[PDB]
Design a protein that fits this description.
It is built from five helices and eight strands; from the N terminus they run E-H-E-E-H-E-E-E-E-H-H-E-H. By secondary structure, it is an alpha/beta fold. The strands form two sheets. It has a six-stranded mixed beta sheet.
């Protein structure tokens, strides 16, 4: 019915970037499609009634798969359902409103040797020049390079341009490999391009309507 969501998984070692990149990507995508960074809904620990969900551009799910009881997988599975997920809402006014977000971004601490539902699956690690006691040195990674800024980003820094963090795209096929994704700027453009495709196939009719 509505556009199929584009799904991004960012995984890797604790505190080596995946969470920071989740938040940067979410706000970047929100900004491209709505003009501002606030069309982001963060899935709460207990997806009881989807409080505050309003068809935001981006849904973020933290640490997907870390609660053994597994409420998070259940709703995630529906969001990327074949049928149109209708989230539970508290007020009669909002009940029945379809789930309609452009991008779902999950962070995960899980190893990858379900996953077939991710359009982008990326391991995030800190590079040596930006690594301090086994964690990303985020202060150094956010230092302004005074390079020309890019797209919606206000300045350039190692976190965004690829010097601070290593992205390793996890691939489904073996000799049909999707191209590498090497920094945030490129990841943002790849997700935008894929959302554009999903929305065009869902809005451009085959038959005159």
């Amino acid at each position: 019915s509505r556009p199929e969501p584009v799904v991004v998984c960012l995984r890797g070692k604790s505190g080596q970037g995946k969470s920071f990149l989740a938040n940067v990507l979410a706000q970047a995508i929100s900004t491209h499609f709505t003009g501002a960074a606030d069309s982001v809904w963060y899935c709460p620990p207990d997806p009881d009634h989807f409080d505050g969900y309003n068809q935001q551009a981006v849904v973020v799910m933290d640490d997907l798969g870390q609660n053994p009881d597994g409420k998070d997988f259940k709703y995630f599975a529906q969001m990327v359902s074949t049928t149109g997920f209708i989230p539970p809402m508290a007020s009669l006014e909002d009940k029945g409103k379809p789930f309609n977000s452009k991008v779902i971004i999950a962070t995960s601490n899980l190893y990858s040797g379900l996953n077939r539902r991710f359009h982008f699956d990326i391991d995030v690690s800190a590079k040596d020049g930006y690594k301090v006691n086994n964690k990303l040195d985020i202060i150094k990674a956010l230092e302004d390079t005074h390079t020309n800024p890019v797209a919606m980003f206000q300045y350039d820094c190692a976190l965004l341009n690829g010097m601070a963090v290593e992205m390793k795209r996890l691939q489904q096929d073996v000799f049909k490999p999707q191209p590498p994704i090497l920094n945030v700027y490129q990841l943002v453009d790849e997700v935008i391009e894929r959302v554009n495709l999903h929305e065009k196939v869902a809005s451009q009719p085959i038959f005159k309507q």
